[PDB]
Write a protein that binds this DNA or RNA. Sequence first.
RNA 1: UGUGGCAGAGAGCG
RNA 2: CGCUCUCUGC
Lengths: 1072, 39, 50, 50, 99
Amino acid sequence: GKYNLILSEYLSFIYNSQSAVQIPIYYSSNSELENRCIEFHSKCLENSKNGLSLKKLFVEYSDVIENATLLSILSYSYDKYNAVERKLVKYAKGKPLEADLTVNELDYENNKITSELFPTAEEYTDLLMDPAILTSLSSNLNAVMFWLEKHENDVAEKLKIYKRRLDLFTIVASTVNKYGVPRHNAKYRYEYEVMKDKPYYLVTWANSSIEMLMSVFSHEDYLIARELIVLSYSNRSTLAKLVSSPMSILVALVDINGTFITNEELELEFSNKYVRAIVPDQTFDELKQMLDNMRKAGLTDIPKMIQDWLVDCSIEKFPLMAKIYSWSFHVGFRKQKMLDAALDQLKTEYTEDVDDEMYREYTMLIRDEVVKMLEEPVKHDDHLLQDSELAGLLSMSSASNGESRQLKFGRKTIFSTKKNMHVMDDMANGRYTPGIIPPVNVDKPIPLGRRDVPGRRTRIIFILPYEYFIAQHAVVEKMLIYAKHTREYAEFYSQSNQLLSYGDVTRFLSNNSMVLYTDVSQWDSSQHNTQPFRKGIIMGLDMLANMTNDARVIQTLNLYKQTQINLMDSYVQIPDGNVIKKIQYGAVASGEKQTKAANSIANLALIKTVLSRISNKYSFATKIIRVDGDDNYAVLQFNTEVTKQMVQDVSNDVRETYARMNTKVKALVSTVGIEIAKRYIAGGKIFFRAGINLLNNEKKGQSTQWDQAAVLYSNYIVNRLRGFETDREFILTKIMQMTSVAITGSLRLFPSERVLTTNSTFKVFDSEDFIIEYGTTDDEVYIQRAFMSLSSQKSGIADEIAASSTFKNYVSRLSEQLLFSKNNIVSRGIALTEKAKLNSYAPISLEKRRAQISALLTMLQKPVTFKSSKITINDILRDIKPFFTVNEAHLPIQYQKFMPTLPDNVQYIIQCIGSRTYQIEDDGSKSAISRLISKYSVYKPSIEELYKVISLHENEIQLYLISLGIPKIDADTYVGSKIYSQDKYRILESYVYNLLSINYGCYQLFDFNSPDLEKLIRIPFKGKIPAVTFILHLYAKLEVINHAIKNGSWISLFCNYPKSEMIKLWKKMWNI
Amino acid sequence: EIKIADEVKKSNKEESKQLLEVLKTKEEHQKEVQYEILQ
Amino acid sequence: LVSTEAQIQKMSQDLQLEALTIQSETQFLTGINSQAANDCFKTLIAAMLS
Amino acid sequence: LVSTEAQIQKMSQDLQLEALTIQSETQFLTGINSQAANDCFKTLIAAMLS
Amino acid sequence: LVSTEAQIQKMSQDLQLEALTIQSETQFLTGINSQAANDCFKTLIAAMLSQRTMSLDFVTTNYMSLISGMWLLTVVPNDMFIRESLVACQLAIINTIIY
RNA sequence: UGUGGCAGAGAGCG
RNA sequence: CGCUCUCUGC
């Protein structure tokens, strides 16, 4: 309830004119007050529409000011062009900045003038520095200047923040004012004709610098920001890659004193174990060279902080490192060219000096792993291998990007890259031919996509046809669904938390063992991911083919095999001007159904093969190896105690034993820590990388101005929890500026906190961070009922595509691969399901969402609507709340910190109740009926459809099950058992279980099975209504936790809930 | 359907609301079993 | 008279009138109001007199 | 005859029906309608005559 | 004291209620709170000292009232209560707990 | 009407 | 379970 005051001050500051007028609009769920709001509205518009002073009425209608709820504020203000400079000249009295063109290796990666690199606009491209966000730099500057203006009279630590950010913003505004501000077009692009006389990389530098200086709260933050902002203006290729590299060594220097553990059964369990840090001597010399590069690039204060920290190697000063490790990735992306980014990967050194003893074992281990994965389904003759074709055609992801193509649906032309639409096209013209796999050769090389991420290389993406997916689908699904019952993969270690993705950095650590951890992200072009990998899988397929007798399965397996045959020789379309290059690349990357598990397999075989060579010089027992695609760590335990020389020699042996296979590596051995791209542990404490650029994006999505405010707030929340903290007021300023909409050149509307923070399809943020909010009042109920009525909208483009011939044909062809006695129950169902993935096509989503926003605006302008009773969640919570009773409590501190970078209130909760004892309610459609259909088919009929289908007679249900391949005897047994009344109740239990509101970012981490939280929740037991008592206890926990987060103190609760309200609520439970 | 003493419907005592909603539950469940058979 | 609502809730309290399982016990509550009590009291006596 | 629904309440009362628990007495209430009973009564005599 | 809420947790986990039943045990839980235990503790002593007689008001549908009335009638002499009140209490106890 | 993906998990819509 | 977003190995 504070946002709106900052909104008012922002409006007053930005416009400032006599002509700038401000027009509230209100609402109330109470008839009389609502009609008085209507009145107020009318009279205000009239008075505005009559050149009368508006300031007189504002006293008379005090009632609206006290009890009504705000929606929005309108604004009539004229063009007033160029006001940014007219404000900004004062905050720019320092000296501007000069680039240094002789820093980056390439020529165009320097921050030189555009015209020196792009004389013609026809060859200009903003894609090498595109912020890719529908908000301007001028917007960012306006926000910064307003913040600076309002914080112009404070005298505290706040003033030290203001002086620091003022000096930084002076450096920035000095750099911009040297030339001026670029002006956005309607699309938020920056054309050639504005950037012609300015540096090419000024905008990204500006945005990133704003993001950094808005995240300054201390002196060391100021040092970091001044030392990165002045070098990120020139260096754009060797900065985040440089400073983020030493961290991998630093983790091997932090003594553990107190630890968190994880079980095989995936539960945290703290340990007071102490572990030293047996670091060798030569890695310090490496680290010094890295700091020498750091100083040689032009960094002075931040080497000083890393060198004076090593005098003590304490863990209390250590979050600084983590802080630094996050300050590197908030400088922007290194959006270089498709060509040179591919050539970062497409440099190869293949040699006739490697072993053969290694590759043969490698091939065999891959073979064996494949057989372990595939023994059960290949043998027991599973439907999904038999019906692999249909399985892949249902699971066609509708963003999949195979080969842009000119289509026509009746009377249109479409340039879709989506493979579902391509399949719809190819079914009609007789070209659908999944058994005949296309080649990938000179006659048909592959396109590319570009994956950028700061501090690392630009990675590449294959863009394949749609036959390869269909071939790979069934086998890879059985592989995943097997190996998540098994070690060595992220599918087994993943839900949200600690006790997961790693969960065994910290069992097998002491002064007996070590751990070798290794980044393997460059190992895609390597000589060990070519021929042996493919031939190993091919051999395994031969074994598995001889391990079955049915013929569709042999066909599917032979097609997967032939896919690996064709992918063994693979060329790559890349244009360059007029001519087209195609390069020999017979190796592995993503853009495939297979890449994750197969890379994990190959790395597993590789590390298992390497690890049988250290045994020639050491005695150890391998306790654990873990592989998640392109990373790997192995722990190993010894017959004796560890030394510095053994770690060093082991590292050299690892490096040279990879060198024997012509494989580059930075071998890293340690005792307490690891480092990988996204996270790391030091001293038995998990930190994380907070490298999510807010004001600069990777690529250009398809969302609106609106939703980008929500993504930016989500990234803010994440980065804040991770450690990187930005000023929340700035984020709110951006949200209002991005939800602002131009109805004309001079009319502009601004919504309020009570529209953006309400649970709907229009939610953007929350009134109190780290807490979703619900509604006990009339008013949230009112607007939620209103907005739920409006979420359901239409798309004429979708309507005409779904009314064409190819869509009908597609449903029919899907159908005819199965039985032919259901025509109005599933064909409509499959069409309704395909509709859920036609919306991926951007113009459909844009039509629907622009229509949705227009429907919103035609009740933001004029008064509001009651929406006719359509029930939602807050209706229920409104009835649950008035039988609670609070009392002040006092919990002690008995739980350990193991995520230091969190805010102190969240940590205080962790420091008073426990971290996660994880639970499960359903691992997907478990109840009675989908685990039969998923055994005889793959089809996934929606629970709406089942809730209807069970309500029908038992005859056409019997027909429907027989139509899905099932025999008659099991249907007869199902009807005789009388389970349909049970699966009504199980399905409605599953409907209440669909409430996903346990995992938003702060509820993600808290343990609700705690005894300390539970003794506060004194709700007596009634019985025979499990859903209600479940949700009541859950909701009471959420009340306690949210009060704790927002206020720190604790409370107890009590709900002597009447039986009458249990029953009155029971019918609204299992609806909506 | 229901032949309660309708003066009792006035009361916001717990037992009265309990009785009303329980009687509605019995009648709606009777309709559930009748729909179950008769389909 | 004894109160109608007090007597109704007392009887339903004694009987354990469930909501889920059917019973032969809802039907005891049919016609427990006053204005029938007086009707019976006036009917028996009027009939025996006449 | 008795109407069907008046008898359905009695059969449900003697066969006390928990909504959740599948006691099989639902099957006892299957096919109780009128004009199936006339069908049987005609069928038996017509067959034993024919 | 024991808090009202934890005592109700113990009693409710004992009684094993039913949210879909018209039970003869929800009425035990009426008025268990403090500020009344205080009131009774204060009233008994004040009345026995001042020798002011004191009536009773109770609902025969509740049966913990009559069970605590047993203790009450034991530790307080009968003549301290007005006649019809304890007669109703004794009659209730004898009719629906004992015979 | 000019186009940047595979799978894991967490939210928001059916 | 169908789609957008968050990052994740790519």
